[PDB]
Design a protein around this ligand. Structure first.
Ligand code: ZN
Length: 73
RNA sequence: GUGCUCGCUUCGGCAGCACAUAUACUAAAAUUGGAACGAUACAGAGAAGAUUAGCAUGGCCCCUGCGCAAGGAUGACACGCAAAUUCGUGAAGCG
């Protein structure tokens, strides 16, 4: 609508570093917490809970998902 | 260390007295371990977004800023909790 919102659409289009990405949520949160704010949210709690519950299924799960993706591309 | 005893009493020594009252992360540190929007290289506004409202509660936090300026950027599965009888139980009291 406005010049500011349009510039913000440019920025928010710009796709950036993992530093705020959480896989457990698959939520690339944003801007100076991201990850720890997942953690604060009850979600990341249940999620890292399940992770510690079955640590060596997620490693392999993701490893493959990625691996097939890379062959694909 | 200063000064004094009609001090021993010479001027050499000893004593007694008057004071003068307790520095200081004392270490040459012993040790201990890290990050850049840096260089290159790439790459190229990557539409995917209409996510159809805003303000709250609230301590959800960090940054710029001298700010009781100003300004950034963020958290929603925010719920089931149950007023309400029914008997049973025990306790008390009265006869
Ligand atoms: Zn997360």
């Amino acid at each position: 609508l406005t010049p500011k919102a349009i510039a913000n659409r440019i920025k928010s289009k710009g796709l950036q570093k993992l530093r705020w990405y959480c896989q457990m949520c698959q939520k690339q949160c944003r801007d100076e917490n991201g990850f720890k704010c997942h953690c604060m949210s009850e979600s990341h709690q249940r999620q890292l809970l399940l992770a510690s519950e079955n640590p060596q299924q997620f490693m392999d799960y993701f490893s493959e998902e990625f691996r097939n993706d890379f062959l694909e591309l």
